[PDB]
From Swiss-Prot, chain C:
Recorded name of the encoding gene: TRPM4
UniProt modification remark: Phosphorylation by PKC leads to increase the sensitivity to Ca(2+).
Protein name: Transient receptor potential cation channel subfamily M member 4
Subunit record text: Homotetramer.
Binding-site residues, Ca(2+) 1: 41, 44-45
Phenotype upon changing residue 45 to A: Loss of the temperature-induced potentiation. Inability to activate at negative membrane potentials
Entry function: Calcium-activated selective cation channel that mediates membrane depolarization. While it is activated by increase in intracellular Ca(2+), it is impermeable to it. Mediates transport of monovalent cations (Na(+) > K(+) > Cs(+) > Li(+)), leading to depolarize the membrane. It thereby plays a central role in cadiomyocytes, neurons from entorhinal cortex, dorsal root and vomeronasal neurons, endocrine pancreas cells, kidney epithelial cells, cochlea hair cells etc.
Domain notes for this protein: TRPM4, is a temperature-sensitive ion channel, it adopts distinct conformations at different temperatures, markedly influencing where and how ligands interact with it. Decavanadate (a positive modulator), ATP (an inhibitor) and Ca(2+) bind to different locations of TRPM4 at physiological temperatures or at lower temperatures.
Organism the protein comes from: Homo sapiens (Human)
Resulting phenotype, residue 81 to T: In PFHB1B; atrioventricular block
């Protein structure tokens, strides 16, 4: 089912040209014991329709009741604990009732790190 | 889904680039939430909602006052 | 009239105290004339608020997103609030980014038990445990709760 991924999506801006996508598939973190995830490499040119169809139909995620996208900074260090409570006892606790997609940085930066741990705790 | 899917943006804080992000997310209509008391672009946008150059310098000491 | 107008040009430095309290008005007047935001100019006001138990003044004026606080600013105020039994300031200072894991050390933990009243029961228990200098709190816990339920303090 993932075979046509290099054909629908492209990797790498007038100095560059598009090429078939190479990095894709499922993703397992070594020794984390977490559920098997999914990942994809794609260019910024990609229109959202193909990616949304991929997520909803190939990866099998159901349509979300609501979507909240969290944007912020502070980079490395974790936020002050009242922001932590706003994330956990606020946004994530509310999203637990309706079911939702929470979109943010997928990195170990502070905001994404605390979003992930709050989602895991309520999971 | 045939129910519409609401989308919301939450702004904890930000640098000068988060102002551009908010402007782009506002021109293409998307509701935004600003966290009060967290400083940065969130507080800068919150305090004007509810000395303007002084405020902009207060939350962006190095910012370009006219462009901001 | 000219003098009064010259004075009233700068109302930020004037406050009215009415008999209908003193500490709140002092805090308001001190905050009103600060201006800067480097978090070094507000330490004095924070110490005064801790000493006078002005929770709302601190939470409203001193801890705003403009002022960029961090741990080393608030450690001394946290210790002051711990020693002098100010629960609201203990809650407020921790919620604003004071890393408790790094803050707590055996030295300060022993210093906290030094704040017990001289005639209190815990003081007598600590003295008896020491007569049987670390705080020796674990010995007191063993004497009180027994081996079955006593925590092996420190945890
Ligand atoms: Ca001062």
């Amino acid at each position: 089912e993932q075979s046509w991924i290099p054909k629908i999506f492209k990797k790498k801006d007038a100095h560059t040209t598009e090429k078939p996508t190479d990095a894709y598939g499922e993703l397992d973190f070594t020794g984390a014991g977490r559920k098997h995830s999914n990942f994809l490499r794609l260019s910024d040119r990609t229109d959202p329709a193909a990616v949304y169809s991929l997520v909803t139909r190939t990866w099998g995620f159901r349509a979300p009741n609501l979507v909240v996208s969290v944007l912020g900074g502070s980079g490395g260090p974790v936020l002050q604990t009242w922001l932590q409570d706003l994330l956990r006892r606020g946004l994530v606790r509310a999203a637990q009732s309706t079911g939702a997609w929470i979109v943010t940085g997928g990195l170990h930066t502070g905001i994404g790190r605390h979003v992930g741990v709050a989602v895991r705790d309520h999971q | 889904t045939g129910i519409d899917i609401p989308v919301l943006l939450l702004l904890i804080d930000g640098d000068e680039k988060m102002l551009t992000r908010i402007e782009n997310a506002t021109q293409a209509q998307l509701p935004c939430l600003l966290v009060a008391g967290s400083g940065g672009a969130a507080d800068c946008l919150a305090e004007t909602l509810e000395e303007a150059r002084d405020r902009i310098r207060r939350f962006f000491p190095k910012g370009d006052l006219e462009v901001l | 009239q000219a003098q009064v107008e010259r004075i009233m040009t700068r109302k930020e430095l004037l406050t009215v105290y009415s008999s209908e309290e003193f500490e709140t008005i002092v805090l308001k007047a001190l905050v009103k004339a600060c201006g800067s935001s480097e978090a070094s100019a507000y330490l004095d006001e924070l110490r005064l608020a801790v000493a006078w138990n002005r929770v709302d003044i601190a939470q409203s004026e001193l801890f705003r997103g403009d002022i960029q606080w961090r741990s080393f600013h608030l450690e001394a105020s946290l210790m002051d609030a711990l020693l002098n039994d100010r629960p609201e300031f203990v809650r407020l200072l921790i919620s604003h980014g004071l890393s408790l894991g790094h803050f707590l050390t055996p030295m300060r933990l022993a210093q906290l038990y030094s704040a017990a009243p001289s005639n209190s029961l815990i003081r007598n228990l600590l003295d008896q445990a020491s007569h049987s200098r670390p705080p020796d709190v674990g010995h007191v816990l063993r004497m009180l709760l027994g081996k079955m339920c006593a925590p092996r303090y420190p945890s």
